[PDB]
Design a protein around this ligand. Structure first.
Ligand code: NA
Length: 130
């Protein structure tokens, strides 16, 4: 299930190019499911994420390092979304009521495109019980 909710949604052929590494995680790090090529985040990298969600910004200063790489926060619904970017590619963290969707991308996949996707599911699960 999670591995379809990810490999059939979180990693589709928009326009003509898949994403890079999707992953759905709990508000605690518990890795519900994730792409084969998703990066070993860190229970903390995650805790920070949660930190900013309650109080926007706080992450942004130091940036978001996770899956190893650091990202430059950008713009997102304070308490609901968070976007990060590193050159061509970047990341997005859709926060559900119990989980957090996540997408990683690199050229030629526009940040826009990523959004569309991570944010897509997020809507769903939210209004479905999570
Ligand atoms: Na949407």
């Amino acid at each position: 299930s999670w591995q379809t909710y990810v490999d059939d949604h979180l990693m589709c052929d928009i326009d003509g190019h898949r994403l890079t590494a999707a992953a759905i995680i709990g508000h605690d790090g518990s890795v519900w499911a994730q792409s084969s090529s998703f990066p070993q985040f860190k229970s903390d990298e995650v805790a920070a994420v949660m930190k900013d969600f309650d109080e926007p910004g706080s992450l942004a200063p130091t940036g978001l390092h996770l899956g190893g790489t650091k990202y430059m926060v950008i713009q997102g619904e304070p308490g609901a979304v968070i976007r990060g970017k590193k050159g061509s590619g970047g990341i997005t963290v859709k926060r559900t009521g119990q989980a957090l969707i996540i997408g990683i991308y690199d050229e030629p996949l526009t940040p826009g495109q990523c959004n569309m996707i991570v944010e897509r599911l997020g809507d769903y699960l939210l209004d479905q019980g999570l």
